[PDB]
Amino acid sequence: LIWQDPLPQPIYNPTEQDIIDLKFAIADSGLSVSELVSVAWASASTFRGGDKRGGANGARLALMPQRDWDVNAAAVRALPVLEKIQKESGKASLADIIVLAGVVGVEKAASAAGLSIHVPFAPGRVDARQDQTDIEMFELLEPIADGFRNYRARLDVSTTESLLIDKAQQLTLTAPEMTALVGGMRVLGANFDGSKNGVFTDRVGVLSNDFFVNLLDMRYEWKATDESKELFEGRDRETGEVKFTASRADLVFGSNSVLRAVAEVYASSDAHEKFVKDFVAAWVKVMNLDRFDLL
Length: 295
Description:
The chain is mainly α.
């Protein structure tokens, strides 16, 4: 109430066939699944329930300061291309198109998992100007951790796994939603980083449930590499090969009572369809967190 971030009147109004031409422009753009999903996730995940600031509306991912955040350094590499596309289409905002990109990325992911879901998209976002994006006040929002992206700074404040809860609650996520969300993001190759931490799959960019299966496989022994236990390795008990690395955000999903009961739904033989759905559902939740006009 006391601080609101201004947004401009929409200068665009895409029809359902604009959108579809846009999805096909993004699809033919050269951006990988992981680049698509990263740029969208990085737009949307600034949301803070209650305060209601941040979110994907306004494309402030493209503005200062978010554009310089360490968390975003890889996500932001996608913007030149998406910008070029928004400008040549002229049917929709950078904001709407950063999100649509995530949408193309998830569906493309899911159709490699030999799935075929449609990711609900909601048009209408506008682009904020730098002048409606107060630097000092979005500075407060730079995240200390985003376990959805396996990002973690300032190792002396609180803990990696507690910051995961905090983050998820900020986005108003339920436990299954965080869960679905984390396991999806891992397999789509959306760490903030190049890290392979938690990327438990041979096929990155396939929206599989590998994260959950591999997470709970007794074939794998997990051990901290050093006294901080910020980094683990999953060694294959058979071959003795180090197959996987993991952070605390990855592994808390197998240590915690509640998170674990959820990961086994999703590691279940028959669960793929259930997880993909739940991912898409939680995915669209985050994308739309700030879409007040719509509700």
